[PDB]
């Protein structure tokens, strides 16, 4: 279904900031602490080597 | 799981799997889902049989069948879309024919098989497991879809026009509670300056029709007025997702409609060369193969923003819960027909000269616009009428019928198109009536024709005053539009409102001299010189009320229910016509913190402004009663006791209905919305008894504020948007000039 891909591309643009075209950082940071779908994707990303000491 | 319920919605529901029950058993149907080899085996043999029958027209049949299957699943609209197997067989719009090209039953079985292969591979796997391990459960669900189809099909075959335009494979789908997606012009929306809408796309349209720039607008989750969304609220029965009799679509959303004859034939020859655009036009076909209307489609991508729900178990319950309700609305019309026949029988029996005041509805009608509406009447009511009166017979009283068609003398446009509004002459009459009754300052702000209310207030205190003047202004205008639609001429109201206002104002001032005269009489215990003047004073002014034209209402007590309860010095402003300045005086008595709160203030019920508005609202109803009473006696020829009986059955007492909402919440405008709704129920109930003809006509002949939705994006009125507390509108231009519906049965149940 072409609509399934279109919606996902829509969500990627806002995170990348293309849709919203600076106060962009507070909006992204605020969204990362509420959304239950963005957090699931983020938690699987590898931790940077500089933050391995923190263990978070 | 939630995925299995969603998969079953697209599998059993959207593919019209109930068709296979005609030729295939329940056991054979389940084997089709569990094996993909059988699906391709049935299509192979089916195409061979249809090829022989179609012969030279096999290419066109195959092309149209595949295109329809794509729409049934992915929602994509092609060029010259045919919505069912009945229209595909006749090949409407491509090649002329005198009958079906091939068998309809074979074509219907082919289309549902084509769309079955279009489902996602992951979704098809889920159904295979269910069909093998849940045999008892799956068979019941399939059998439930057969009953839904037969009931929907039983209504479609009645009329030939709705048979060619109904949608194959239809199943209801519910949006999310709170969201709202609309399509509107860019230039018109800019001046609104609404802060709750954002642009998520643009409407490309098609090359067939040329129009101005449009776009899509979305509103996130919020609170909306009751009965404004979530349910279909249509007033006409539907079968297959389209209106019965006309074929116009109602189950889905469309961006517009074109029905003008000169405009339709200009589109038809423009589409002959070719069509280009993301949103093509859907044609509506006649009973002879011609085109009578066009509709603008909606991009399926934008429907993803609504977050629709497709739970199979829940949608079936909603589907059956709507067919039962629509069956009751048809039975109510059938009973109303019997009452009309009994009235005609007795009058004829009493005297044979009473047949000269009856008009045959089903006979010949000279008016062309009225005659066309009668032809498209539902075929179920036509059979009932012909059963009692006789073939092509429907007799109703002439005078009562004329009251049902008085709207058209002041309304222009077509309701189906979506551009129905009052005539320019009517607005100039209503606008001048509001200025006289209310204040000049209030009219300038509330009834501005170039700027919205929110663009004229630049203070925190002014918002409190403005948010209060609207409540009586809406009630004053809602009564004027209601009485116009019920048959009262616009000339009677124009020349009577200034006359009745002066009488009420005179009574208030005259009463003030005699209410305190009792104190003078009590203090005049002595020489008769003071008594003689006092005795003559009260009797002289009492007779002035006797000759008043509003005296019968005063005697009944309704006109004096609150007049003698209490009087205030500042209440003279509301009688003079200084409503705006009246609200300022009561607003200055509020605490400084509350006054400067702006739009966040929570006005209590014990303050002076809360009670000051109630007096103004009840004062506006005083004028309405005078006009209603005069009409029922002057132009209706009824006794004085008859008119007073009807007046008391259309108004309620507001002191018995206080607010019952949560604390710490602004609900000043929401409370008045519910109070007005209750009064509308009383009016609707009395319409059935005192005017049976108007009740039947209201659901047959289209009229402004007489029909519900027509599939176009939801448009609000003065009542709907008042309850939300918004201020980005005006009662003088564009939106805000529309009145709620006047359908008797619709208001009773919805």
Curated annotation (Swiss-Prot), chain B:
<feature type="coiled-coil region">
    <location>
        <begin position="27"/>
        <end position="60"/>
    </location>
</feature>
<protein>
    <recommendedName>
        <fullName>Virion DNA-directed RNA polymerase</fullName>
    </recommendedName>
</protein>
<comment type="function">
    <text>DNA-dependent RNA polymerase, which is injected into the host upon infection and transcribes the phage early genes from promoters that have a 5-bp stem-3 nt loop hairpin structure.</text>
</comment>
<comment type="similarity">
    <text>Belongs to the phage and mitochondrial RNA polymerase family.</text>
</comment>
